[PDB]
Amino acid sequence: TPITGKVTAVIGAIVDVHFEQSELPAILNALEIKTPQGKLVLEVAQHLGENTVRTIAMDGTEGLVRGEKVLDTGGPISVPVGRETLGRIINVIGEPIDERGPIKSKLRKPIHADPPSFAEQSTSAEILETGIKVVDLLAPYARGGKIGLFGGAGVGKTVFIQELINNIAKAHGGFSVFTGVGERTREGNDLYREMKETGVINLEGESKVALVFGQMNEPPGARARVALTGLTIAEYFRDEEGQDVLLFIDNIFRFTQAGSEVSALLGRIPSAVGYQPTLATDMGLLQERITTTKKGSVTSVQAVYVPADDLTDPAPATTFAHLDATTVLSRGISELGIYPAVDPLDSKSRLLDAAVVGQEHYDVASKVQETLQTYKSLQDIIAILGMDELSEQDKLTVERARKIQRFLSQPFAVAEVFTGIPGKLVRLKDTVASFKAVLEGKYDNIPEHAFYMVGGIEDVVAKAEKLAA
Amino acid sequence: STPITGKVTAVIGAIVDVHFEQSELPAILNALEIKTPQGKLVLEVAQHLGENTVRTIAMDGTEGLVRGEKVLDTGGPISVPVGRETLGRIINVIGEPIDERGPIKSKLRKPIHADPPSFAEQSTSAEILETGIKVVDLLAPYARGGKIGLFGGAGVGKTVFIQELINNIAKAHGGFSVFTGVGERTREGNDLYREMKETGVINLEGESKVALVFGQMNEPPGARARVALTGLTIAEYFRDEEGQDVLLFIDNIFRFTQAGSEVSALLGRIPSAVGYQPTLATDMGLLQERITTTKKGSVTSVQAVYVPADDLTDPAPATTFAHLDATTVLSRGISELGIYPAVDPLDSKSRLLDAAVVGQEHYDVASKVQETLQTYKSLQDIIAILGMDELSEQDKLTVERARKIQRFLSQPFAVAEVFTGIPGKLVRLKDTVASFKAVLEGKYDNIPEHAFYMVGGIEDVVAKAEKLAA
Amino acid sequence: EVSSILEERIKGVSDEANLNETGRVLAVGDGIARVFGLNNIQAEELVEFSSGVKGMALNLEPGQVGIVLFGSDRLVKEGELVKRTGNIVDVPVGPGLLGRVVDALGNPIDGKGPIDAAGRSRAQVKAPGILPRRSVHEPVQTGLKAVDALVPIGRGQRELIIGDRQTGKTAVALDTILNQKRWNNGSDESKKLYCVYVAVGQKRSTVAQLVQTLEQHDAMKYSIIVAATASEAAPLQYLAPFTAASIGEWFRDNGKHALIVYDDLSKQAVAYRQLSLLLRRPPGREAYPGDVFYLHSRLLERAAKLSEKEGSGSLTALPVIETQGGDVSAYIPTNVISITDGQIFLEAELFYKGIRPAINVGLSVSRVGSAAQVKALKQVAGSLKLFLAQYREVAAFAQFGSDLDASTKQTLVRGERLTQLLKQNQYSPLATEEQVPLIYAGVNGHLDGIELSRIGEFESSFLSYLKSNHNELLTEIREKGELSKELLASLKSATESFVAT
Amino acid sequence: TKAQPTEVSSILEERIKGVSDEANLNETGRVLAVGDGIARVFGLNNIQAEELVEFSSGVKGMALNLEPGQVGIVLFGSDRLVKEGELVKRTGNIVDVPVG
Amino acid sequence: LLERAAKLSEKEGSGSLTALPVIETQGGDVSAYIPTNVISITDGQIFLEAELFYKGIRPAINVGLSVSRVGSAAQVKALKQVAGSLKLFLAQYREVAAFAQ
Amino acid sequence: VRYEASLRQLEQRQLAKSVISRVQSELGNPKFQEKVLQQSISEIEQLLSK
Amino acid sequence: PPPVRLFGVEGTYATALYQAAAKNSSIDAAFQSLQKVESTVKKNPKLGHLLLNPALSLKDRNSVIDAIVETHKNLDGYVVNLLKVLSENNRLGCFEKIASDFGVLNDAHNGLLKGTVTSAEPLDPKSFKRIEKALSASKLVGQGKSLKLENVVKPEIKGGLIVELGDKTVDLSISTKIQKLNKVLED
């Protein structure tokens, strides 16, 4: 509507407008301030009455002069969706930031949308093989699954995701969405280049992937609805196109982080550790909009830059609420040289079970966990005393755990370059077999180093021959 | 005069502000009653915010309050009923019998804002309470008119200890007792009512040798704070007016602390350390000073305390640790050992434990106990990893005596026929001094550790030695 | 058909009257409106915003009365009128909820259509007195042996399930429901616990998996699922236990026994945290305003083993606080621990150790009863506790691997076998008549000899053997529920018969 | 617009009524509100810092906060009888105790 | 600040502004909000070892906590060839002295 | 039974949007004018009854 | 005396003025004089919007008061004593607010009430009158209680009508009924 207004205040990027006319806006409406910086998009977030709203500002702020006209463009911002959004990198306003020229589209849809109901649910979880032993063993993936990574400060959170994309998303023909919230531009350039190169984006051709990328530098408010924009793209694919979907989100600590910044300014008492009191509603909403329906079971992968690695901080804690699998990755375990760097006693999946992946798998995993937990327990004794002051039975366990640990070191594929060691990807069927034998100590008699940085049991054997030479 | 009409303006939980008539306010600490289908909502006046608008704290529910609602003024501090015709009634916070044995009170009501008596009245009479519980008597004798403090985990025998005290001491001693419940369960209430009906202390016919004031945590925080104050005034009526000595019991006073911290925050008063009211000390002081050994009477309070995570250097217990005359620490470990009572032997320190005020003989025996136990405890660490293979025979005899003593502490309790199933044993002070002395001298190092377990004095210890022997 | 139902619906609306209350919205945004006017507003009343949003009013101020929205922000508009429903919040309460998932406001979200609730009630009903209680004598058996033995569960009793998040946190409770299938199957109505599973803060998919599990175990029939999904509003999340409580109280009042699982109250606390801070109330300790204790206490004290007068109907509660990092010193965990009649500490390390269920038994207590378990089972597990208590000390000696006293290592050897005996795979409970033998064998030391690896093998086989031969013995344990001399001897002979061989 | 202690409605109405409470209240005072034992007194304009002031409740106090409109007395005495508009005479002698 | 430092593309003239942001960590405790916030932006860290500084490497580069995630794709082939992955090798040195005790 | 129930639900939502179409039809008509008179006289009747 | 407290808007400051001049019982006079000074402030818009914008000293603010009584010496002494307060606290932004509030208080004291019969379209004078009759007939607006039922056009209430006054409304409209109809036929 032509609700004229003035910019009464510009207190940061939480501009307050005074809509001069007593014509009322509505919460979650969108406004265009037209400036020589083009349009600036604001989103009505409070009505403070007297027709004086308080508005979140999506695009950049500066230059603003108080008493500047507003126009209400209403409702939630309308993204552009269709199959002709497949292959684009999208801002938030639908703009192609990979600059493929105005995004061709069918139907343009509001950013905000409702979370599918309890009735709309149709929850299913398959098995999905990642070609990574540690992942498969500890947390078997699934279709429609919700995966969560609680890795470091992009120390290889990105690397982990890239490998997963390389394996799973090029082994998934159905649509897949990459939404990268507040992440570094270079990663985006690398990814875009790689995608175009790996034909997942055929540039001239069609893409079975779509990409949304939101740069960290971009104002917090933009990052908040970068996610919502992506969720709309996903919903269009899930619903309207109907096709099988996947979704990747990294860094969703930034989603939380952005929200906490605006919350204080908005005038909301920022709850514990400065994090917004509305943290729960937002995380919940996002994860109830990304949900498995009969329309489509959406596999989601969420990557949390755990802040200073505190997972007891409310933002990681509330992530746990809406996940079905986690593969918390410890920065320490990265330092030990183990790549994958996933903490193994802090990995879980609902699909790890004695019949969901079989009793044999479950038993094999159980023994690995028990062995490692014992080893962790004997870390005190080992250090204060020695390993020769350990019991012989324990010394076998310790040697086994050291071997198992080293076995878990399995080179990365995308980061075959970055690690500098050719990637080792191993089938799920192979994994169960390999661990069963090792647990029976059948291969525990060959160098611990042989187990180190290699794939399957056969590879360990071959590297033993290499070491022998 | 006339009940000042006030109109509620803001219901913001328990804090309810009233807009009393122009040029007329009550004074701080007065009592407002608001007629409701909830009877009288009692608001304790706690601030005046001026403009004939007071800010008062509710003790009871604030549902359905119409903002603008007429508030009658009793006009003066909350006055409960006190009497000797309060004996054998369960009475809620607002002084209403919830065992409903008609209108209680002797002939009097008194305010619960009773003052702490001056220094001149308060004169310490060091006199010896005797619980008959051997460990309690010997290693930290309790004292009449005292302010005993049962720090422990939630019902780590805390309820049991008090029940045992009531079973022995309450009926035995001529003074009345008052059981005051601060945020304790109605489940716990039914057990207490039943148990003291059973011990007959609640004499079903006529007067009981105890009165009950059972307060519940479900009730808003205001009621939780001033259930304690209510109980205190009944005890004061016994102490003062009727002269009578008492043996007060409060449970858990952590609920009192917790309640006060909350309403400090709610009053707007910025919470101090670990979120606890900056006014903690003076509130504790007011409570403690009111309970006293005076010329008028003597009140022997035993106040249960719940110690969060059994950590009492936490400011709410730690401040209380100063304020109580005769601290006792009870905990999980001793409970788990199956020892009744759950008192930690080397951790607990009562007011009296002097070298001859408890009697020189008593003291010397108890000093010998302390050394014997202390030796076992020090050596416990060596034995744990290294073993007892590197310790001497003399040390081993001391360890053996301590283990025997450790389970000598286990003395059955009749009110833990509910728990253990074993009827109690009560051992006189003289009998305890004698019985413990013998063991230490080594006269009963030939009596197995378990023949000290769950039995009374030396006579019983010998009898169970014989029982285990054959 | 659908036309007929619609014709009834169209018929079902006509005519209205003057609205004597009003107030004009001003603040709006932050999902908490504050409206100007409203003096007729009775506290906690439900107020219908003209948008179509309903919000109860929890804060009254002589400026602007703070009405907590259940509905969406955008729908509400500044200057709207709100007309008071004139009713303090109420929920339909009855037996129609049996076999129903319901959201906070009691709408069947499973969409099994309308509920045959026999009343509506209020969510602010207060806890029954000392006099309305009766002595607790109603055992509850979870089918997990450790729970029954170590922390025996009565009825009208609060047992707090505490421990690290989603370590099958849901699953421990579900196991109870499954062994309570046996009593439910049993026609003794007062032993039929109508189980109310309250799910606060959880996603629809998780819930959908839970309802699938429950429907699979066909326990859903007597189950009521009260939900406040992750989507659902923070006021509605706060209100969800209290309205769950009302549904439970209808059973309790009727003399019927029921069980309420409050999973997870930790997310309820966050909801009240949010709610309070957007009612602008000062942050409490850990941003949960103090009176949160008052809120929780009134809720929890409505689980009661009522008098014979009240039909003995006892609603039993199992609160669940999912402690993050086992942080029990956190204000809400400290608060709850005091309120509850048991704590059932679980530990992640013991999960990793392979003890599944993983129970930190040292801090697991049930302060109340032993008529909260079977008499027979009380006799056998008497020294299960003693052995385990000795085992704890012994295990400490065993650590650092110092050369144990032979006696301590006897304890160690016995203790280990017991530990393996306790472990049970999720969604497999065990009938008490056949938990008494296993514990008899262990406690009467016959298992102490049997090697740790084949304890699991032994256990399975032992059960099969008793089914074949000493099924008479099982029948007697079922029938008489207190081990007599004859049963102890018979059982000893049977145990010997299969321990040897 | 903003909150000011002189804009307290009883003070304000008198001033509007052409009656200024100043002169009378330079020593004496009148409590505006007493909550938390923090009487805020209008008057005492001849007060010296930390001077001893005596209420008509017999309460003695010291005045840690001197603000122009209000003097935030801290009571040595109790709050129990104290109420709005309490006469606070200014003893006019800074806190002293016998020494010797 | 940081994302204004870039290796541009041929259209933009390929120009660079190489950012090397130098964080002075007191105690070198890099689990800490300010260091971690930087780490997520950056590719690589250059943590320095005090023990080694004293032990005569001026300056002394901790190599456990020095990483460079995408470093070797900047490298020219001589400097790709000569180094086969000394970090791996010296994380065998690290392991060896780890298990020496 | 499952498809039968689904068909009733489907019938209900189809007939629901058909109801929306009738609502849009009513608000077009100068029943939109005439019902203001109906509401007016109804308020006269109600408020006189108050 | 207060003609019913107005507080929630810091109107207690206005209430104080009202009751103080009510006790002098020169409220009509006060109200009229308040209109005159407010009007000549507005009709001196340059430095009667920017002299309603504080930036004035103690002395300059006081001299502004002196300039104000230069504008007219008939003004009523009680609102001149209020002016002293407003100068001293330098408050003056809620001056027209006080004028409006004093008006509200005045016509509350008179017992006159306003009113609106918002519709999405113009509303007949016959409708005003008939509803005014009905409303006067209702106990809701008695006598001594005046009512000015006016048309407002607000498409927010799409079609229909809502009668409003005294926090009592009768809403017989199409929009509310449609809302309910839709909802109930979505049941």
Cβ <8 Å between C13 and G184: yes
Picking from C35, C165, C203 by the largest number of A CB atoms within 10 A of its own CB, the best residue to mutate is C203
Is C170 annotated for ligand binding? yes
Confirm or reject contact between D36 and chain B (CB < 8 A): yes
- Specify the CATH number for the domain of residue A416: 1.10.1140.10
CB A149 within 8 A of CB A161: yes
Taking alpha carbons only, the member of F46, G138, G156, G131 closest to residue C15 is F46
Among the partner residues B66, B258, B385, nearest to C41 by beta-carbon distance: B66
Strand C314-322 versus strand C258-263 pairing type: parallel
Binding residues of A for ATP: 151-158
Cβ contacts of C284 on chain A, cutoff 8 Å: none
Pairing of strands D60-66, D71-75: antiparallel
User: Taking the C-alpha atoms of C202, C205, C208 and C214 in order, what is their torsion angle to the nearest 10 degrees?
Assistant: -70
End-to-end CA distance of chain A: 79
Q: Which of C280, C285, C367, C454 is catalytic?
A: C367
Pair (A91, A235) in one structural domain: yes
Burial class (CB in 10 A: 0-12, 13-18, 19+), G107: middle
Distance CA C394, CA B93 (A): 49
Instruction: Compute how many other C-beta atoms are within 10 angstroms of the C-beta atom of residue A383.
Output: 10
SS3 labels along chain B: CCCCCEEEEEEECCEEEEEECCCCCCCCCCEEEEEECCEEEEEEEEEECCCCCEEEEECCCCCCCECCCEEEEEEECCEEEECCCCCCCEECCCCCECCCCCCCCCCEEEECCCCCCCCCCECCCCEEECCCCHHHHHHCCEEECCEEEEEECCCCCHHHHHHHHHHHHHHHCCCCCEEEECCCCHHHHHHHHHHHHHCCCCCCCCCCCCEEEECCCCCCHHHHHHHHHHHHHHHHHHHCCCCCCECEEEECHHHHHHHHHHHHHHCCCCCCHHHCCCCHHHHHHHHHHHCCEECCCEECEEEEEECHHHCCCCHHHHHHHHHCCEEEEECHHHHHCCCCCCEEEEEEECCCCCCCCCCHHHHHHHHHHHHHHHHHHHHHHHHHHCCHHHCCHHHHHHHHHHHHHHCCCCCCCHHHCCCCCCCCCCCCHHHHHHHHHHHHHCCCCCCCHHHCCCCCCHHHHHHHHHHHHC
Question: In this structure, are B267 and B168 located in the same domain?
Answer: yes
All chains having 3 or more CB pairs closer than 8 angstroms to chain E: A
B91 and B174 in a single domain? The answer is yes
Same domain as B441, residue B454 = yes
Count of B-C CB contacts under 8 Å: 150
Cβ distance C203 to A284 less than 8 Å, yes or no, reads yes
- C229 φ, ψ to 5°? -75, 170
**End-to-end CA distance of chain B, in Å?**
80
The contacts of residue A362 (CB under 8 Å, 6+ apart) are A352, A353, A354, A355
Question: Is B421 known to sit in a ligand binding site?
Answer: no
Helix%, strand%, coil% for chain A, nearest 5: 35, 20, 45
Q: Are A373 and C349 in contact (CB under 8 A)?
A: yes
CB contact under 8 A, D15 and G85: yes
Size of interface D-G (CB pairs under 8 A): 48
CA distance C486 to C482: 11
Domain check: are B227 and B373 in the same one? Answer: no
Of G23, G89, G94, the CB nearest to D17: G23
Please tell me which residue of chain D has the smallest CA distance to B53: D33
Q: Smallest Cα–Cα separation from C41: which of B42, B61, B11?
A: B11
Contacting residues of A for E43, CB less than 8 Å apart: 186
Which subunits have 3 or more CB–CB pairs within 8 Å of chain D?
B, G
Alpha-carbon distance B224 to B228, whole Å?
Answer: 7
Residues of C in contact with A321 (CB under 8 A): 201-203, 230, 267
Among A52, A76, A100, the domain boundary falls at: A76
**What residues contact C148, with CB distance under 8 A and at least 6 apart?**
C141, C142, C373, C374, C377, C381, C432, C435
Q: What does the radius of gyration of chain B's CA atoms come to, in whole angstroms? A: 25
Using the 3D structure, point to which of A326, A351, A376 is the last residue of a domain: A351
For F21, residues 6+ apart whose C-beta sits below 8 A from its C-beta are: none
Give every CB contact of residue A209 below 8 A, 6+ residues apart in sequence.
A86, A87, A169, A175, A176, A177, A178, A195, A200, A201
Chains contacting F (3 or more CB pairs within 8 Å): C, G
Structural domain boundaries enclosing B348: 78-352
Active site residues of B: 158, 184-185
> Hey, how many other C-beta atoms are within 10 angstroms of the C-beta on A11?
11
Q: Does C395 touch chain A (CB under 8 A)?
A: no
Distance from CA of G104 to the nearest CA of D (A): 18
User: Distance (Å, rounded) from C-alpha A243 to C-alpha A175?
Assistant: 7
- B165 and B91 within one domain: yes
My answer on whether B238 and B319 are in the same domain is yes
Q: Subunits touching G (CB < 8 Å, at least 3 pairs)? A: C, D, F
SS3 labels along A362-407? HHHHHHHHHHHHHHHHCHHHHHHCCCCCCCHHHHHHHHHHHHHHHH
- Resolved by: cryo-EM
Is C164 labeled as ligand-binding? yes
Q: Which residues contact B369 (CB under 8 A, 6 or more apart)?
A: B138, B139, B405, B436, B440
Q: List chain C residues with CB under 8 Å of B221.
A: 290-291, 293-294
Residues A53/A46, Cβ–Cβ less than 8 Å: yes
Token pair 């075959």 in the structure block, residue: A416
Measured over all CA atoms, what is the biggest interatomic distance in chain G, rounded to whole angstroms?
Answer: 70
CB contact under 8 A, G168 and C18: yes
* Contact present, C138 and C315 (Cβ < 8 Å): no
DSSP D48: P
Cβ of E36 and A309 within 8 Å? yes
C81–G168 C-beta distance less than 8 A: no
Chain G residues whose CB is inside 8 A of the D3 CB are: 10
Residue G77: which of D3, D15, D18 has the nearest Cβ?
D18
- Residues A321 and C267: beta-carbon distance below 8 Å: yes
**Among candidate residues A277, B9, A22, the one with its CA nearest the CA of residue C64:** B9
If asked whether residues B300 and B448 sit together in one domain, one would say no
CB contact under 8 A, C73 and A117: no
Is A221 in the same domain as A129?
Answer: yes
Find the helix or strand (DSSP H, E) in which C342 lies: strand C342-345
Q: Which residues, numbered 186 to 205 in chain C, qualify as contacts with chain A under a Cβ-Cβ cut-off of 8 Å?
A: 201-205
Name all domains of chain C by residue range, CATH numbers in brackets. 15-87 (2.40.30.20), 88-373 (3.40.50.300), 374-501 (1.20.150.20)
| CATH number given to D21-93 | 2.40.30.20
What are the angstrom distances between the C-alpha of D10 and each of A401, B52, C39, G78? 81, 10, 25, 15
When divided into structural domains, chain A yields a total of 3
For G94, nearest residue in chain D (alpha carbons): D1
φ, ψ (nearest 5 deg) of residue G5: -60, 135
Q: How far is CA B367 from CA B343, B437, C402, in A?
A: 17, 10, 35
Please give the biggest Cα pair distance in chain B: 86
Residue type, C194: Y
Closest-CA residue of chain D to B56: D35
- The answer to whether C255 and C132 are in contact (CB under 8 A) is no
End-to-end CA distance of chain E: 46
The residue assigned the tokens 């197995």 is B448
Q: Are residues B370 and B323 part of one domain? A: no
Is the domain of B159 the same as that of B170? yes
- First CA to last CA distance, chain C: 68
Same domain, B86 and B203: yes
The residue among A76, A101, A125 that closes a domain is A76
Question: Nearest 5°: CA angle at A385, between A383 and A386?
Answer: 80
Angle at B438 (CA atoms; ends B435, B443), nearest 5 degrees: 135
Contact F40 G159 (CB under 8 A): no
Q: Is C106 annotated as a binding residue?
A: no
CB B365 within 8 A of CB B436: yes
The alpha carbon of residue G145 is apart from the nearest alpha carbon of chain D, in Å, by 27
Query: Which of G88, G114, G145, G108 has its CA nearest to residue G19?
Result: G108
**Of B187, B124, B165, B168, nearest to B179 (Cα)?**
B165
- Assess if CATH 1.10.520.20 describes domain G11-110: yes
Sheet holding C54-59, edge to edge: C23-27, C32-37, C64-69, C54-59, C45-49, C82-88
